[PDB]
Paper text:
The rhabdovirus matrix (M) protein is small (∼20–25 kDa) but plays a number of roles during the replication cycle of the virus. The M protein is an important structural component of rhabdovirus virions, forming a layer between the glycoprotein- (G-) containing outer membrane and the nucleocapsid core composed of the virus nucleoprotein (N), polymerase (L), phosphoprotein (P) and RNA genome. In addition to its structural roles, M has been implicated in controlling the balance between transcription and replication of the viral genome, in promoting budding, and in modulating host-cell transcription, -translation and -apoptosis. To further investigate the role of the N terminus and hydrophobic surface-exposed loop and to investigate the structural conservation of M across Rhabdoviridae, we solved the structures of full-length M from VSV serotype New Jersey (VSVNJ) and from the lyssavirus Lagos bat virus (LBV).
Author numbering: 30 to 37, 48 to 202
The structure:
């Protein structure tokens, strides 16, 4: 099955703490998650200059295996990642992210509530490129959310963020 039943030029190093709690009485599937996040561009309430970071994080966070905590499945990610932007996209100097938002999906019988918490502070710990050593789910999620990128000509494995 695919189902999860109820619990019963500009470069930045960001220390990142990511948490998504999914709330679903009837349980949920990856398919539903992909439908929800399809429209993240038009739901995200945070700092636009940082939506690139958030999408990346949301993708990695949801590509892990969660844990049951109360009436929620809980995905946690805690990494130090390096992001590179093209042109003039991305955060201004010394700018940081403290984002949280409830996204609630509701379609007839199916009902899923996503609680997203992403914090990102600039640290001096050399971090890892977000776009290497990910898994198919991470990629699949970045594709859904329409993650805008452009390829680095220097390094093959590198993607510049366009948002």
């Amino acid at each position: 099955d695919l189902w999860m039943p109820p619990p019963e030029e500009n470069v930045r190093n960001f220390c990142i703490n990511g948490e998504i709690k999914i709330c679903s009485p009837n349980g949920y599937s990856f398919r539903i998650l992909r439908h929800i996040l399809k429209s993240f561009d038009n739901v995200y309430s945070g700092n636009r200059r940082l939506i690139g970071v958030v999408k990346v994080v949301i993708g990695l966070v949801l590509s892990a295996s969660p844990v049951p905590e109360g009436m929620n499945w809980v995905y946690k990610l805690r990494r130090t990642l390096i992001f590179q932007w093209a042109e003039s996209h991305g955060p201004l100097e010394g700018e940081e992210l403290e984002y949280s938002q409830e996204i609630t999906w509701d379609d007839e019988a199916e009902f899923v509530s996503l609680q997203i918490r992403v914090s990102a502070k600039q640290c001096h710990i050399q971090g890892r490129l977000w776009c290497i050593n990910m898994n198919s789910k991470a990629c699949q999620l970045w594709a859904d959310m329409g993650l805008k990128t452009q390829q680095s000509q220097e390094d093959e494995n590198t993607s510049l963020l366009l948002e």
